[PDB]
Amino acid sequence: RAGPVTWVMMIACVVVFIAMQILGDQEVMLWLAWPFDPTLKFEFWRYFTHALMHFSLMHILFNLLWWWYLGGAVEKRLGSGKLIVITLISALLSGYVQQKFSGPWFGGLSGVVYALMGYVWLRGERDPQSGIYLQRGLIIFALIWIVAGWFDANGAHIAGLAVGLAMAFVDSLNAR
Description:
PDB class: membrane protein
Shape: globular
GO cellular component, one term: plasma membrane
CATH class: Mainly Alpha
Active site: 110, 157
Number of helices: 8
GO molecular function: endopeptidase activity; identical protein binding; serine-type endopeptidase activity
Order of helices and strands: HHHHHHHH
Protein name: Rhomboid protease GlpG
């Protein structure tokens, strides 16, 4: 019984993906991508909407699997507000980093998913009573996955893991 935010996000990603299949990636990127020219500087939604675009089935399929389980866990035990904050801040800062690496043409919940990984893990390690935790097995796929990216690029994974670890560390200061 996943919460609202978890559901809305999932629906939002499927709606955009379908829109992309009907209109074409490039066409949807013109409206949803990170500002690609000074004139779009104030299209404030762009700093977040890039996370709603995916370029294949596995891409959105894998991202939505992690989101539903990690975001669901977070929303159930920590509330919708917490999930919204983690999402917004991870989408923004992860988009910001990716941008300087490969330019404005990118998309996906990768950065957001990693923040959830980094948040749910450190959070469960520092504040067990939070009711959240990332299986030490899953934390291995994650890191194995990032390293695999640096070879076989998406600096969104790194900037995302950072925001999550940071926020978690911060929400865990009041030890228990």
